């Protein structure tokens, strides 16, 4: 049989919200995408959809898994950190949580 | 019937303005009171404190006093009062008064179903 994987997304880590030294704006999140280190590398992923996946307690419509969706808006800084805007702001417990950056909508 | 076409109803703020220390004293009601002390932090508008009501929170004039269904409430006590909404079944919804008896409620609900006007709490006393 096949011994291959099935990953068609790219991994990321959710760092924090858009913030100053004290004030924090959860309307925009900061992500590392795996393997990007430069603003030019992060310029590819602008406009790509992004999904954060978590588990709940109750069973609704055949699933215990909920997804919050968003898109990558603009680069941040110089180290390839990207800004993401979602339909709902991310939980603050998700600092250090893995997120799935899609390959679509593609311009290739 | 269905409400008339309107702009999207937007609410600038949905959380109620609480009185300062109304959560700490049971002698203080949750109704809004302006702090008038010269050194009160809410009055001096320090960050992290309670906001005050202002005229910047006022909702749109086109969506003013409108329910999310797109209707404006009209308090009704009798059949002659619900007949006043013969022209506004697309913008006005009848709200039955709390002290109206059950038979009069049934008569008003029947007349309102005839007129095609929405009753907000027509499931009352059934």
């Amino acid at each position: 049989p096949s011994e291959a994987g099935h990953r068609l997304y790219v991994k990321g880590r959710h760092l924090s919200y858009q913030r100053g030294r004290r004030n924090t704006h959860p309307k925009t999140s900061l992500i590392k995408i795996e393997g990007v280190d430069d603003t030019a590398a992060a310029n590819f992923y602008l406009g790509k959809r992004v999904a954060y996946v978590y588990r709940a307690q109750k069973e609704v419509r055949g699933t215990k898994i909920r997804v919050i969706w968003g898109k990558i808006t603009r680069p941040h800084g110089n180290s390839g950190v990207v800004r993401a805007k979602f339909t709902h702001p991310l939980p603050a417990r998700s600092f250090g949580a893995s997120v799935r950056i899609m390959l679509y909508p593609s311009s290739i | 019937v269905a409400a008339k076409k309107h702009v999207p109803i937007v609410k600038k703020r949905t959380k109620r303005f609480m009185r300062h220390q109304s959560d700490r004293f049971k002698c203080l009601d949750s109704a809004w009171r302006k702090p008038k002390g010269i050194d009160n932090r809410v009055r001096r508008r320090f960050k992290g404190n309670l906001a005050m009501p202002s005229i910047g929170y006022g909702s749109n004039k086109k969506t003013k006093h409108m329910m999310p269904s797109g209707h404006k409430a009209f308090l009704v006590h009798n059949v002659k009062d619900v007949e006043l909404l013969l022209m506004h079944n697309r913008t006005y919804a009848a709200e039955i008064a709390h002290n109206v008896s059950s038979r009069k409620r049934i008569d008003i609900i029947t007349r309102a179903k005839q007129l095609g006007v929405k009753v907000t709490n027509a499931k009352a006393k059934v």
Binding site: L15, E34, G96, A97 | -
Partner: protein
């Protein structure tokens, strides 16, 4: 930038503050970090300066009751590294505690980390950071002088682990050689079209 399940770092030849800052950033980002051999960790400057710093740290204690609230002086090199890491982390927050539970520090290389691949951090290496002629000290030596009792036990455990690693080294050398003549013997039976296409593509 590569995400791993857990990253094992040999503590030998590393600088305390720079390594601590790097691993603290990794822990707060969400990367699980294990640091081994904290006895071979390095601090720049002359050794009597570090002795001044640790004895000044020893001076502090709660006056009315030393059993509560006071600065508790952990003499182990791994615990000194843990204090340096913790000072760079908001440890009194729930996020800080949930990051600190992702860190483990040890003296020597306890099993089964002895049979796992160890990373090194170039941004904290002494040979890549310090100028020649500048003095340096050993965290293990400082710990031994300030009261850490287990220098010789770690020494003999590391000696036996190095003997076993040497045995694994001649096994690995034998495997590497016989793989080399395996590839050389198989090279005669490779299809020439496969050879040319692989050479053109880059293997």
């Amino acid at each position: 930038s590569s995400f791993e399940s857990v990253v094992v770092i040999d503590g030998k030849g590393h600088l305390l503050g720079r390594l601590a800052s790097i691993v603290a950033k990794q822990l707060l980002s969400g990367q699980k970090i294990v640091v081994v051999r904290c006895e071979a960790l390095n601090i720049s400057g002359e050794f009597f300066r570090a002795k001044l710093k640790y004895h000044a740290y020893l001076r502090k204690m709660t006056r009315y009751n030393p059993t509560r609230g006071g600065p508790f002086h952990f003499r182990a090199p791994s615990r000194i590294f843990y204090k340096a890491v913790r000072g760079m982390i908001p440890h009194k927050t729930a996020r800080g505690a949930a990051a600190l539970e992702r860190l483990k520090v040890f003296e020597g290389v306890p099993p089964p980390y002895d049979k796992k691949k160890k990373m090194v951090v170039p941004q904290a290496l002494r040979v890549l950071r310090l100028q020649p002629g500048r003095k340096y000290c050993t965290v293990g030596r400082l710990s031994h002088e300030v009261g850490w009792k287990y220098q010789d036990v770690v020494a003999r455990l590391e000696e036996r682990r190095k003997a076993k690693g040497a045995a694994y080294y001649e096994r690995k050398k034998l495997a590497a050689r016989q793989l080399s003549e395996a590839k050389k013997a198989a090279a005669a039976k490779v299809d020439p079209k496969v050879s040319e296409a692989l050479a053109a593509y880059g293997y």
